[PDB]
């Protein structure tokens, strides 16, 4: 795959202008899941409720799930490949992972991403963390 430099340097930014602030775009980022995959509350206990801004495993999922999503760009930068951890692939296993949840969970995640950059955003920066995503996708769906 490539991935370039400056695909990285973009990815890299965006992910430290998430970190800014990881309360305030969680919620972005889950309230897109539940908006788009309203089933997303009886696997993700921590949302059975709606958004629970007080849980604090929202916030830990969610920085994790993005960082995960970094450390892929890094991988296609590095390698150009992206591996997954057993663990990753073993839960995703389950009948609930399909093809058109990982359109749900891309779409959320980029959506998190432009309000988190602001007027930064772009057609190119939404490509990087498209590929970066992509890529790790395929990398649990076998691994
Ligand atoms: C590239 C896309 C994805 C990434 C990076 C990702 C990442 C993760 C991570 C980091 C965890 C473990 C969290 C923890 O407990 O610390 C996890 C678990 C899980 N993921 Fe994702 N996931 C992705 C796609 C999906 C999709 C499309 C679905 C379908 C709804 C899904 C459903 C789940 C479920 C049900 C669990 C287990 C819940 C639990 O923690 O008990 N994942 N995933
Ligand atoms: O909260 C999580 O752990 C999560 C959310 C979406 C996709 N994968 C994992």
Do not use: C, M
């Not at 202008?17 to 969680?26: E, H, L, T």
């Not at 994790?64 to 450390?71: Q, T, Y």
């Amino acid at each position: 795959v490539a991935f370039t430099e400056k695909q990285d340097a973009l990815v890299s930014s965006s992910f430290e202008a998430f970190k800014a602030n990881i309360p305030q775009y969680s919620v972005v980022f889950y309230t897109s899941i539940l908006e788009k995959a309203p089933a997303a509350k009886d696997l993700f206990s921590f949302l059975a409720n709606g958004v629970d801004p007080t849980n604090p495993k929202l916030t830990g999922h969610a920085e994790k799930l993005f960082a995960l999503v970094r450390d892929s760009a890094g991988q296609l930068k590095a390698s150009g490949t992206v591996v997954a951890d057993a663990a990753l692939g073993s839960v995703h296993a389950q009948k609930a992972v399909t093809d058109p949840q990982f359109v749900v969970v891309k779409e959320a995640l980029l959506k998190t991403i432009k309000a988190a950059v602001g007027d930064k955003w772009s057609d190119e920066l939404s490509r990087a963390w498209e590929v970066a995503y992509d890529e790790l996708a395929a990398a649990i769906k076998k691994a």
